[PDB]
Single-chain antibody
């Protein structure tokens, strides 16, 4: 996994830096203002800022270390920031940095709910607002009170590059239907550790599995293994 500080505190108007290490490549930065709301990409591929993100957010990579900088931080920037990257043929995240401030693309997941231990689930993500067949897609989950965990990734052709986190390898199948603009996650022999919000995620690339490249998130579907 990646490594980032557990917490940072800042006054409104500060210039805040959060570092992350451990990626074989670039760094992505994902803002989560509430444990129950989807992350928002503020930086991807180390320094790329989405158009809808305020210019006070910037990123850089030096050596093998990524830094998110917020120049003139505002109260509304209070959030947990996760870094994302890759290593050992999989995407991976840091454990999150809690920042305390002392002052058209759609992804729609379904298939969650209560599950039986040892049972199986089938999650579907319906995409709209973009050319679905041009982008790599993936799944990211978040257990209650924990951080983002990369689950699986699939290339735009639905065939070439398929990868699974060690935690689900042997139990998981990711697939896509480009005609229907959907991506699917099957997961069997369910265990208590599979209890999580599962997020559909678009990467800003055609085939990459790098968790630094995520630029769109679904609303999440809750899975409870009981």
């Amino acid at each position: 996994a990646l490594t980032q500080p557990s917490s940072v505190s800042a006054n409104p108007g500060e210039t805040v830096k959060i570092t992350c290490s451990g990626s074989s490549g670039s760094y992505g930065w994902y803002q989560q203002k509430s444990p129950d709301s989807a992350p928002v990409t503020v930086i991807y591929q180390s320094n790329q800022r989405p158009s809808d993100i305020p210019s006070r957010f910037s990123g850089s990579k030096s050596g093998s270390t990524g830094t998110l900088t917020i120049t003139g931080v505002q109260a509304e920037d209070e959030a947990v920031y996760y870094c994302g990257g890759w290593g050992s043929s999989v995407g991976m995240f840091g454990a999150g940095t809690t920042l305390t401030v002392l002052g058209a693309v759609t992804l729609d997941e379904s298939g969650g709910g209560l599950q039986t231990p040892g049972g199986a689930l089938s999650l579907v993500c319906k995409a709209s607002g973009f050319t679905f067949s041009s982008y790599a897609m993936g799944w990211v989950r978040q257990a209650p009170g924990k951080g983002l965990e990369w689950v699986a990734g699939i290339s735009d052709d639905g065939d070439s590059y398929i990868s699974y986190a060690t935690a689900v390898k042997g139990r998981a199948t990711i697939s896509r239907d480009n005609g229907q603009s959907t991506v699917r996650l099957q997961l069997n022999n369910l265990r208590a550790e599979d209890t999580a919000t599962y997020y559909c995620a678009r990467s800003h690339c055609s085939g990459c599995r790098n968790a630094a490249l995520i630029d769109a998130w679904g609303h999440g579907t809750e899975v409870i293994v009981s």
